[PDB]
């Protein structure tokens, strides 16, 4: 009851590591706002984006829900817990450099 989950794919860690897949990597830099960025990551191994505020700054600069991240502000976070990534982004600067898997409608 407590968790909801969004993405249909159960696990995509191994497929993400493999070079052969429809996804094309993209790096997104998000600037802070007066009330927050407005994105949540709740993926255990891949740390996929859980939800994005449609009116938030993240939604303006792409950052769709169906995405996966591997590195934040330079540091590679491809294999860590979601809670640890949340600690890293908060302790970092207001502007966050993020990499989005951005699956090509697959």
């Amino acid at each position: 009851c407590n968790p909801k989950s969004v993405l249909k794919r159960p696990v995509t860690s191994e497929e993400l590591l493999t070079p052969g897949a429809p996804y094309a990597r993209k790096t997104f830099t998000i600037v802070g706002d007066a009330v927050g960025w407005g994105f949540v990551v709740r993926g255990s191994k891949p740390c996929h984006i859980q939800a994005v505020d449609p009116s938030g700054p993240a939604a303006a600069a792409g950052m769709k829900v169906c995405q996966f991240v591997v590195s934040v502000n330079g540091l590679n976070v491809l294999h860590v817990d979601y809670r640890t990534v949340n600690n890293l982004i908060l302790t970092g600067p207001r502007t966050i450099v993020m990499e989005v898997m951005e699956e090509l409608e697959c």
Partner: protein
Amino acid sequence: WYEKLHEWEDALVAYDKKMDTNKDDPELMLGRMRCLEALGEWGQLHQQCCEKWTLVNDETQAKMARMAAAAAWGLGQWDSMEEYTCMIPRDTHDGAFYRAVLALHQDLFSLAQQCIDKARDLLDAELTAMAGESYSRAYGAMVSCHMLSELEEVIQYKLVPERREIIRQIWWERLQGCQRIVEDWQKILMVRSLVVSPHEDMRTWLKYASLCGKSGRLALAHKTLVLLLGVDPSRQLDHPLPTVHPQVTYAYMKNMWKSARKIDAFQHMQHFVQTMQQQAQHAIATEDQQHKQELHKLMARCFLKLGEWQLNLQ
């Protein structure tokens, strides 16, 4: 129609007939959430919002986001409140208040200050229009800015430990002037929970529990008493009531008399007054300044109830 009268107990049963008999458009389910939130039953609201959070329209869940966040806050599940918070519109007073209290939980003092300032300007437009008619009309917004100033004191509470003896003294005297409304006290007291546990100050919660029973629902007033004790006396009747916290158990025995038990309460009252006399004596340490006088004051109330109740019974 029942919602417009601030009468929620009969409003919920009305929606049950229109929903249980036949499922309909997602407008009746949203109506129940506005009723469960007012009543204060976070257990039933949380399971409905979480289950329905997926199979609803994107615009539909915008209205549901604010009510779902309150249920998670009441249950203390901060792991899921974050997901509900990021969907409330950010250009509204409620959209910044709920993401300001979220910064306090994760210890982001700088981010929280901007949100508090951001929420004041949004509430400014709503307050000036209502204040132009009369003060009574402009009261639902004044209680909102009252809660905004409480968040600032929460930041001060978490920073300087030397002031955690007068912060929980303004909160008491400031609440006395507020209107005695169950809904108003439910929101304010929920704000005063990120730092101070209910077991840290029973003085404020006992007054809130009495208000719910006296003018509202007895069920809500009963669950707020077992929370302070830590155990539910209703489960086992043969066992005696807890001896510690004499003030808390005194109010519990009055609750039994009011609702259904005019005989079990009298039996427990006799055992309570009997044990306090032994507790009053056999005390080598002397605390006649405060403790002894306070203990004796409670004895007079306990004995007065014995005389009144026995005449009613016999």
